[PDB]
Each structure stands twice: as structure tokens, then as C-alpha cells.
Amino acid sequence: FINDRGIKVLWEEAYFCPCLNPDTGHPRVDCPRCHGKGIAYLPPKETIM
Amino acid sequence: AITSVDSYLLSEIKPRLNTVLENCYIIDEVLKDFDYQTRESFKEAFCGKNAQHEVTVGFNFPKFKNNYEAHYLIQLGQGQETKNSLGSIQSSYFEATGDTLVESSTAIREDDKLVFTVSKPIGELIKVEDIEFAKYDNLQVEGNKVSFKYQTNEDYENYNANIIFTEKKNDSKGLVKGFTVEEQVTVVGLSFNVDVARCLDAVLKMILISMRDSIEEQQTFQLQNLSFGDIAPIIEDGDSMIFGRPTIIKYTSSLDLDYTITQDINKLTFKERKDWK
Numbered sequence: 001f002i003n004d005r006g007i008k009v010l011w012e013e014a015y016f017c018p019c020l021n022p023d024t025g026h027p028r029v030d031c032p033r034c035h036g037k038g039i040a041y042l043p044p045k046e047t048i049m
Numbered sequence: 050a051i052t053s054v055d056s057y058l059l060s061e062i063k064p065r066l067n068t069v070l071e072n073c074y075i076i077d078e079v080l081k082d083f084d085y086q087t088r089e090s091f092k093e094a095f096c097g098k099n100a101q102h103e104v105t106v107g108f109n110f111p112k113f114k115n116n117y118e119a120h121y122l123i124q125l126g127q128g129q130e131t132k133n134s135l136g137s138i139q140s141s142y143f144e145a146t147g148d149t150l151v152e153s154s155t156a157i158r159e160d161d162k163l164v165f166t167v168s169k170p171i172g173e174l175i176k177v178e179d180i181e182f183a184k185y186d187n188l189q190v191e192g193n194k195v196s197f198k199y200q201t202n203e204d205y206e207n208y209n210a211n212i213i214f215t216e217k218k219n220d221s222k223g224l225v226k227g228f229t230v231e232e233q234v235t236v237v238g239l240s241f242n243v244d245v246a247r248c249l250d251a252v253l254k255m256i257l258i259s260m261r262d263s264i265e266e267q268q269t270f271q272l273q274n275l276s277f278g279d280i281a282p283i284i285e286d287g288d289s290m291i292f293g294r295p296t297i298i299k300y301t302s303s304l305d306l307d308y309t310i311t312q313d314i315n316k317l318t319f320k321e322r323k324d325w326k
């Protein structure tokens with residue numbers, strides 16, 4: 001039922017990026033692993049939702 | 050004149066912001082008190098000629114999306130009239146004078162005078178930089194030129210100077226009528242990164258300190274006074290919050306009009322008339 005009704009999506013899993021400032025606790029705005037969001041993402045996974 | 054503090058601030062902040070951001074050691078000095086990683090990340094992202102991100106400045110209520118990574122929002126505030134003159138006479142003039150200007154110029158020889166040429170008719174000369182003339186020097190101003198005796202001054206035949214002066218509109222009499230207003234403008238550095246908001250606050254305070262010496266707000270917009278708000282989420286229900294710290298800039302300035310007087314009197318005349326009663 002879900003495979004019939006859902007649309008194909010790419011799912012990628014959140015984790016906090018280890019670029020957070022050890023004092024201020026905020027992300028580095030130049031970080032390449034996360035583009036200023038505090039959250040980095042694992043490689044994408046194909047799923048239907 | 051009538052004045053528009055918001056447009057002044059936009060015009061003044063934008064070039065100054067650009068010229069600081071293109072100059073790495075200025076930011077390195079401004080941010081010396083911040084955490085090392087905050088400083089280096091800001092300098093890497095926004096600073097220097099190779100900077101891939103950019104800051105932006107503009108008024109509030111645009112119809113388009115802004116650069117919410119770093120954006121100075123300018124926001125015209127309250128004001129009130131504070132001091133009035135007797136008769137509302139702010140000043141009087143014999144010759145309608147425009148804005149104050151400073152221009153670079155060089156001397157040239159002409160007919161055994163030195164002259165400086167200026168782009169506009171000189172309504173009043175305030176200062177020729179680094180020169181004080183004696184009466185012997187026969188200082189004269191005419192049209193858009195300043196002229197200066199050659200005889201004793203031949204060593205200066207190509208001397209480079211800055212002229213501080215003011216335009217003239219026209220040869221007319223009048224009264225400058227008006228009053229003083231105290232007026233507020235708010236500025237906020239929006240960023241979705243809190244450390245960027247804090248750095249934009251520091252940069253803006255530096256810019257305003259530097260601005261206090263400018264001719265614009267030395268002659269007008271006097272008594273700059275700064276107040277600072279809390280850092281808070283400006284918008285809270287996106288995929289992320291947007292933060293900012295407001296600052297309020299308050300200025301005292303004159304609002305006035307040139308009431309020209311057409312009446313002129315150039316001769317009294319006297320007559321005696323006899324009363325035979």
C-alpha cells in the first residue's frame with residue numbers, strides 16, 4: 001500500500017556537525033560539511049514516502 | 050534643509066561597509082576581542098576580495114527575499130522638535146549657499162598668479178588645506194577659482210591641496226526659517242547564525258564611530274547617540290530562527306527653508322516740507 005501511494009524521495013539523516021564552536025556552541029559559518037546550519041547530513045538513502 | 054536620516058545612513062553605511070570588508074586587517078583589529086574561531090570563521094566567510102558570502106544593506110518592507118545570512122535592515126524611527134529660535138530664524142544670508150564640499154586640487158601658474166580650480170562656483174571658502182595667506186599674498190576668489198599671488202610662491206607652482214568650500218545657488222537675500230529635530234533610526238544585523246549577528250554588531254559600531262568624523266554629520270545630524278537592544282529571534286517559525294541585535298541611532302538636526310526676501314532698498318532720500326499752519 002505505501003509503495004503504491006507514496007512518492008519517491010531521497011532521505012538523508014541528520015546529526016550535529018562537529019564544527020560547533022567549543023565555547024559559543026554555534027556553527028562555524030564557513031564550514032564546508034554544513035553550510036552554516038548546525039546540522040550535518042549523512043549520505044542520501046532512496047525511500048518512498 | 051529638509052533631511053532624510055534613513056537615506057543618509059544607507060548612503061553612508063554601504064560604501065564604508067564595503068571598504069572595511071575588502072580590507073582584512075581592519076576586521077582582524079575590530080574582532081580582536083572575540084573567540085578565535087568566531088573571528089577566523091567570519092574573516093574566512095565574509096572578508097577579503099575572495100569572500101564568497103556577502104553582506105547587504107537596505108530599508109525594511111521589501112517585496113523580495115533578502116540575504117538572511119547577513120543583512121543590515123535600516124528602519125526609520127520616531128522624532129520630535131526640541132529647540133526653537135526666536136522668530137524661528139535659524140540664520141540669515143546675503144548669498145544663497147548650497148552644501149559644503151571638500152575637493153582635491155592642484156595649483157597652476159596663470160599670468161603670474163597661482164590659481165586653484167574648483168568644480169563649482171565658490172559661495173564661501175572655508176579652508177585651503179595647510180595654507181594661511183598673508184595680506185601680501187593678495188588672496189582673491191572669483192567664480193569657481195581661487196587665486197593666489199605667484200611672486201614669492203614660485204616653489205609652490207604645482208602644490209597639491211584640498212579645498213573646503215560651499216556652493217552658491219544664487220545672489221539673493223533671505224532668512225533661513227526652521228527648527229531643530231531629534232530623530233531616531235533603528236539598524237539591525239540579521240543573521241541565522243548568532244555569531245554572525247554578534248560580529249555584524251561589532252562592525253556596525255565601528256562604522257558609526259568612524260562616521261562621527263564625517264563632514265555630513267559634523268555640519269548636520271549632530272550629537273549621534275547610540276542605544277542597543279537584546280539579541281533575540283526576529284523570526285522564529287522557519288526551518289531555522291533568524292537572529293538580530295537592534296541598535297538605535299539618534300541624531301539632532303535642523304529642518305529649515307530658505308525664505309528669500311525680494312525687498313531691497315538702495316537709497317534713502319530726504320525732503321523738507323513747510324507747515325504754514
Ligand SMILES: [Zn+2]
Pocket residue numbers: 017018019020027028031032033034038040
Ligand atoms: Zn559544520
